[PDB]
Each structure stands twice: as C-alpha cells, then as structure tokens.
Amino acid sequence: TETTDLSLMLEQLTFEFLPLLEEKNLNWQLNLQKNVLATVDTEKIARVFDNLIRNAINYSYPDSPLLLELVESDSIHIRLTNRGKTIPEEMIGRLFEPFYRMDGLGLPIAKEILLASGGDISAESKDETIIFNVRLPKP
Ligand SMILES: [Mg+2]
C-alpha cells in the first residue's frame, strides 16, 4: 500500500520528457501543487501518466503548450490539456471502451487501473482543446 508523492513524480516526468517535446516545438505549462500524496502504487500511476503524456504529444498541434495541473481538494485532481483537432462528442463518449481505437493508446486500461485505485479518468474536448481529467482519492 504505497504512498506516492504525485508532485515529485510529475515534476520529474515533465523534466524527463523535455527532449520528446522538441520535435513538434511543444512546451510545458505547469501548475503543480506541492506535497500532494496519494495512496497508489508509484510505478503503476507513473506508467499511466507516461501514456497520457505520450498521447498528448502525439495529439498536439505543433508550437503549442501542454498544460499539466495537479490540485488537492476533496480529491486529488490531475488535468492534462493539449491543443489539437477537436474530438467529436460521439468519439469522446467511447474513448475508454476497449478496442474502440480499432473500430491515443492505453485509455481503456487507464480507466480500469484508476477505477480499481478508487479514482477515475474522463475526457473532454471543445474548441481545439483536448482535456484528460484524472481523479485519485486523498489519503
Ligand atoms: Mg515494474
């Protein structure tokens, strides 16, 4: 039953990804609150975030920011926003359905992981913006 410092994790992950932002001239815009702890396996959640960031890099328009926000309120909230082609509402509703991408990677599995961790994930898209919202329980 590990405790993960999500603030440290995302500070490190965003730094490590810097070389991968160069090809499309992306930049981080970070709003990461500090000392945000969650009861979740560290490597498991880091692998979920790695996949969400890689999807955001691949989705993104060039010359654009990737906005990553970490807030502690009644739950812990992580939001990753990129600019890109708007995802239509029909598609948004199916992003977490297994094998829909065969009808971004890893989205059904992200939801399975987060639900079993006592949290969840959702997606929104409007006005050339694509947003993934992750919730985790506060200890
Ligand atoms: Mg391992």
Numbering used by the authors: 210 to 312, 323 to 358
Study authors write:
VanS is a sensor histidine kinase that responds to the presence of vancomycin by autophosphorylating and subsequently transferring the phosphoryl group to the response regulator, VanR. The phosphotransfer activates VanR as a transcription factor, which initiates the expression of resistance genes. The VanS sensor kinase is organized into several structural domains, which include a periplasmic sensor domain flanked by two transmembrane helices, a membrane-proximal HAMP domain, a dimerization-and-histidine-phosphorylation (DHp) domain, and a catalytic ATP-binding (CA) domain. Here, we present X-ray crystal structures for the catalytic and ATP-binding (CA) domains of two VanS proteins, derived from vancomycin-resistant enterococci types A and C. Both proteins adopt the canonical Bergerat fold that has been observed for CA domains of other prokaryotic histidine kinases.
The structure of the VanSC CA domain was determined by molecular replacement, using an ensemble of homology models as probes. The crystal asymmetric unit contains two copies of the CA domain, related by an approximate twofold axis of symmetry. The two protomers in the asymmetric unit are highly similar, with superposition yielding an RMSD for Cα positions of 0.25 Å (0.74 Å for all atoms). Metal ions also figure in the crystal packing of the VanSC protein, with 3 Mg2+ ions being situated in two different lattice interfaces. In particular, helix α3 occupies very different positions in the two structures, being positioned much closer to the nucleotide-binding site in VanSA than in VanSC. Hence, it seems likely that the ATP lids of VanSA and VanSC can adopt a range of positions, and crystallization of these two proteins has selected for two different conformers. The N291D VanSC CA domain was also less stable than its wildtype form, but we were able to express and purify sufficient quantities to perform binding studies. The mutant’s affinity for TNP–ATP was decreased relative to wildtype; unfortunately, the ATP competition assay could not be performed, as protein precipitated in the presence of high concentrations of ATP. We were able to perform equilibrium dialysis experiments with the mutant, but these assays showed no evidence of ATP binding. Finally, it is interesting to note that our two CA domains are derived from two different “flavors” of VRE, namely types A and C. Type A VRE exhibit inducible resistance to vancomycin, that is, cell wall precursors are not altered in the absence of the antibiotic; in contrast, many (but not all) type C VRE exhibit constitutive resistance, meaning that the resistance phenotype is observed in both the presence and absence of the antibiotic.
